[PDB]
Amino acid sequence: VALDVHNAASAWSKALLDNAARPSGAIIYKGADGQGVLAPEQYERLIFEMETHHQGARNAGRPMLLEGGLDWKPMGFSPSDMEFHETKAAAAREIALAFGVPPMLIGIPGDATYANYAEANRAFYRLTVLPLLTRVSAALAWWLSGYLGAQIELKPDLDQVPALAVERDQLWARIGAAGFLSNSEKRVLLGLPPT
Amino acid sequence: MMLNEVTAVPGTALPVAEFRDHLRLGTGFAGAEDAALLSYLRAAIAAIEGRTAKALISRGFRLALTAWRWGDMQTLPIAPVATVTALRLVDAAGVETPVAAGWRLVPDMARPRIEALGAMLPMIPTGGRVEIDFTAGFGASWSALPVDLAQAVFLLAAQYYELRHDGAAAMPFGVMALIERWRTVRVLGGRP
């Protein structure tokens, strides 16, 4: 549903820029009667003084002598910005909610849930990447081990990955400052071969 | 900018005979002499050629102005123009030297304008303001007019005849609704 709200609200603004008549105003010619068109000698005159003198950036404010019968009624365009703007941004985040990405990574505007991207990238590789890749690599581990005789295990390393470095350095600071246990006893905690 | 006319219309070009056929003919009594009727048509031509900025009998004008508006322009006010006669360019005292080149009359009912060739228009001396004599109007006779404009003269000159002072009495195509398409529609009240 949120894909269809996000597609159509971006197609709302796409269409609205392509089929919408705003006028900057209207010159109303009622006439002596209740209705009256103006002659083609008058209409070519009225375009020429509207084109040359009253349109453009170079003509902003010409005081526009309205004769008897003529009138300039300026139109507005009252909903200008933000046609389905917050329903699109909420739809743009409930797409990111389902796939599991946090909104900081792809660039969704909104509130700051995560702070400084080192915890937003670490939340990405722990909530929706490493749970996803450990289920694919475990299915590669069983299916490929039907071809060679020995059963193989094949799991992601969750080390030398750059997003879990804030997970890793506080581990190296935790047992590294634990000075009571010996040097061969803390190499085995970090996954180092003791020498 | 004065724009006085050279010669008035003679009255033998005005339809004082066709006005009484509008006035009392077909329905009525077969009243006043020609000098009373002719005082009401030219009082109704001059009311419509002032509201619509036209000329209707094609007499000759003289537009004497002191500064051009642009250098490729100076629209002429009386609308249906033909055959600008001369562009006299007097000095102070005025030995009265005409010019004969540089401009083109552009006959146009919208903006009858004088539009010099290129980008430069004949300049004006100090004190010697330039005069234009032109012959603006529809035709020399009355049968050359647009008939709706000629009818609104008769609808108005029969109003000035059949009721004398400013008394009491709008129909679909009245006097106002017929001359509303010969009036000048301009929406520039600005600097240029």
How is B36-104 classified by DSSP, letter by letter? HHHHHHHHHHHHHHHHTT--SS-EEEEEEESS-SSSS--B-SSSSEEEEEEEEE--SS---EEE-SSB-
> Best residue in B76, B180, B191 to probe A by mutation, most A CBs within 10 Å?
B180
| Conformational region of residue B133, where left means phi above 0, alpha means psi within -120 to 50, and beta covers everything else | beta
Q: Is A172 near chain B, with CB under 8 Å? A: no
CB-count exposure of residue B19 (10 Å: 0-12, 13-18, 19+):
buried
Q: A73 near A61, Cβ under 8 Å?
A: no
DSSP string for residues in A86-127: HHHHHHHHHHHHHH---HHHHT--S--SSSSSTTHHHHHHHH
Q: Is A169 near chain B, with CB under 8 Å? A: no
Q: Cβ of B167: how many Cβ atoms within 10 Å?
A: 6
Residues of chain B neighbouring A39 (CB-CB closer than 8 A): 181-182
Q: Do B185 and A29 touch (CB under 8 A)?
A: yes
CA gap B182, A41 in Å, rounded: 9
Helix (H, G, I), strand (E, B) or coil at B106: strand
CA gap B156, B45 in Å, rounded: 9
Measure in Å the smallest separation between the Cα of B74 and chain A Cα atoms.
14
Q: B129 near B65, Cβ under 8 Å?
A: yes
Paired strand residues for B61: B5, B134
CA gap A180, A193 in Å, rounded: 20
Q: Do B187 and A46 touch (CB under 8 A)?
A: yes
Angle of helix A2-18 versus helix A86-99 axis, rounded to 10: 150
> Best residue in A43, A53, A73 to probe B by mutation, most B CBs within 10 Å?
A53
The set of long-range contacts for A82-87, using a CB threshold of 8 Å and a minimum separation of 24, is A83/A9, A83/A12, A83/A13, A83/A16, A84/A9, A84/A12, A84/A13, A87/A5, A87/A9
Task: Identify the CA nearest to A72 among candidates A49, A104, A88, A98.
Answer: A49
For A55, the closest chain B residue by CA position comes to B188
CA gap B179, A117 in Å, rounded: 76
For A44, the closest chain B residue by CA position comes to B110
Residues in contact with B64: Cβ distance below 8 Å, sequence separation at least 6, in sequence order: B1, B2, B3, B129, B130, B131, B132
Residues of chain B neighbouring A53 (CB-CB closer than 8 A): 187-188, 190, 192
Q: Do A32 and B182 touch (CB under 8 A)?
A: no
For B80, the closest chain A residue by CA position comes to A41
For A72, the closest chain B residue by CA position comes to B187
Measure in Å the smallest separation between the Cα of B17 and chain A Cα atoms.
30
Residues of chain A neighbouring B182 (CB-CB closer than 8 A): 39
Paired strand residues for B86: B133
Of A32, A52, A70, the CB nearest to B177: A32
CA gap B39, B8 in Å, rounded: 13
